[PDB]
Amino acid sequence: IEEGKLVIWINGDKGYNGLAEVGKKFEKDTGIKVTVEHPDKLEEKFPQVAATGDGPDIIFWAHDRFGGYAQSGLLAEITPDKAFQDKLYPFTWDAVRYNGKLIAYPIAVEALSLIYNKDLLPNPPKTWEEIPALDKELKAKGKSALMFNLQEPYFTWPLIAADGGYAFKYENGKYDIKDVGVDNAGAKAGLTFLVDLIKNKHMNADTDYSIAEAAFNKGETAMTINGPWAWSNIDTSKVNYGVTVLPTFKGQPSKPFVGVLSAGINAASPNKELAKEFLENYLLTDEGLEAVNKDKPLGAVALKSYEEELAKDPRIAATMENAQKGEIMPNIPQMSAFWYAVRTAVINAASGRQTVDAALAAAQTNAAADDPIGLFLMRPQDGEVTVGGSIVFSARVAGASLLKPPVVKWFKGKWVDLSSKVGQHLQLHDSYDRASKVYLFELHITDAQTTSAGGYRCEVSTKDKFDSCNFNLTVHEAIGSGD
């Protein structure tokens, strides 16, 4: 009763209200309603929901996540005409290329900068090493020098990488997925410096994104480390801030990762054409990007015409100076393993639960680890459902032999093979996508009952290999059934 609908997911720190404004212009022109959501952990949830119908038509994230999604067949291939391709910077298209395919529309280039309060700190430090002394000075005055998010490795990486840390080695035109730079002398020096800041009480291991933002925006701390999306909240506050180059460490620049905010289209969306129309004709226009940017700044936008108009913004200039000193994020599937490993290391080293050496050595091994067997690309995860509701569990498997596909069997408990229970309340659905060479296997549980709850198993086999995983279903009583 709208003409149609598009569902968009974007992270909660981005300009979702501006994006909804572009959506309202789309609706008015087109009759198609646009809903912009920003669920928690959307980037982890997307693979599970992509092909169920609870998936978004469009997903926004930095480009690093998208190679993994593409390996799993989750993203529609983008094949633009030259006319449109030429409107965006080739650099931004490069970020969304995976094994010869464009897998998203690039939106904007982001990097972290040093953001400082000019009334507490007219001249911000040039080196990380000066920060302890600055903080002693500010503490005597009831403030602190620096607060930033210590829970996400994105924010600590620039210091870790400064003297020699790296994610994956790049050479002869490709990333070496096995060659990781997490436990070298450089990374250890950077993480040790961070840990010592915390030991010396210049920072607190528990500081997260909200805490640091509140502290900076209320004038409690002289500096923070953040990206373009944060500037508009600071504008609302009383703070006179600058945006500048990150401090050096051991004489070397901090090396922030460069992220390209990108918009991928769900391969399972029935609305791919509408999604492209929205993205090309509404969002990636001067007027569209202005709406989003005015909500939460995007950085250096991919659209040449508008990037040129904003380039005079000194905040954007500083963003790009930091970006030039840093490294572009890889988009390889292994980046997930890298990020999870480094997150663990920083949190454990910062809190004192592990030594820096132990944290980084473990993270080095974990970031490079492979799936031993190499069948599952995506495993079904624990689920919850209300009594009478429906739930879909999914597995994705990498195809290999053309002649002998992988075969999946689903079980409840030790031995009940669910193909023997297909009926009114259970379905099994298989498909293959030759574009991605990915097999999708689904188990559908409908009219869920208390008895449906418990442990299940998904077994995948080929002529010579086998793997299996377990997952749990929790069945909740409906609200209003009691009392």
Ligand SMILES: OC[C@H]1O[C@H](O[C@H]2[C@H](O)[C@@H](O)[C@@H](O[C@H]3[C@H](O)[C@@H](O)[C@@H](O)O[C@@H]3CO)O[C@@H]2CO)[C@H](O)[C@@H](O)[C@@H]1O
């Ligand atoms: O820490 C665990 C975490 O690792 C992974 O997230 C990384 C992102 O994929 C990556 O893009 C980057 O995220 C930052 C955005 O680019 C930026 O625009 C912004 O919103 O801040 C984000 C950092 O909070 O960095 C992280 C790691 O910090 C992964 O894909 C997640 O599932 C995950 O929970």
